[PDB]
Amino acid sequence: GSSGSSGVELHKLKLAELKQECLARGLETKGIKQDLIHRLQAYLEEHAESGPSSG
């Protein structure tokens, strides 16, 4: 409505948060912050729910 935030970003999440997400998903919680995020994004894009059909 006002002064709100529409859209979640992994970056915002801390190292502990990123690792937690990977654990629940069942991915490798190894590497650094970038490693966790990169893996999360790759998985999201691959296991995309809605079609990319943009426009």
Side-chain angles (χ1 to χ4, degrees):
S2 286
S3 204
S5 181
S6 286
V8 298
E9 288 187 302
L10 306 167
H11 318 82
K12 288 197 288 181
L13 295 169
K14 301 194 190 295
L15 189 67
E17 291 282 66
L18 299 167
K19 279 199 152 185
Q20 192 68 276
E21 285 275 89
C22 296
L23 210 164
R25 292 195 191 285
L27 305 162
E28 206 77 42
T29 63
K30 74 154 62 166
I32 63 164
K33 176 166 172 199
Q34 277 155 59
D35 282 303
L36 292 160
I37 290 161
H38 202 227
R39 208 177 209 288
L40 291 156
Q41 273 188 40
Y43 173 71
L44 283 165
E45 58 175 57
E46 199 190 273
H47 284 219
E49 284 201 292
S50 296
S53 63
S54 173

